[PDB]
Symmetry: C5
Subunit: 41 residues, 5 copies
């Protein structure tokens, strides 16, 4: 059971890393939106 | 089995926290788009 | 095994609800982009 | 074990459908950003 | 357990591929925001 559960945990850690990567891109988008707003203002 | 399943549940809850953070960045993006729209409008 | 699986399914459904909520915020963003575009056009 | 694992697979496929919906909203955002960019240009 | 676990890992990799596709769309969005900001600047 443990060796098999290691497989799932590994895949979960992969998904976490990808969600983190997606969040880094969202943060970049928000920062650009702030810049655009400041410019319009 | 119980100890092994606990591992998965722990990783799932970590993912929940990460999705919450991503959601807040979506909230931030919506607020900025709203501000941008209002200035235009 | 079943009782343990009950636990996992419950947590998976929490994840589903969170992705749904995230999607609701994305829809709001798309709607505002549509409003902004429509404004620029006129 | 099989009946129980079917439960997880069913929930994973529900999530897959929701991520697809989220991706369509990303596709929509990219399309509108392209339109906005074209108008500005 | 192994055969059943293969099933779960398979579905997990489907989710990974889908999240990657979503990320590519987000990157496209960021790139367009950069172009839009730059146009505003010039």
């Amino acid at each position: 059971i443990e060796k098999q559960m290691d497989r799932v945990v590994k895949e979960m850690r992969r998904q976490l890393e990808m969600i983190d990567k997606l969040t880094t891109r969202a943060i970049e988008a928000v920062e650009l939106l702030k810049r655009i707003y400041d410019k319009l203002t």
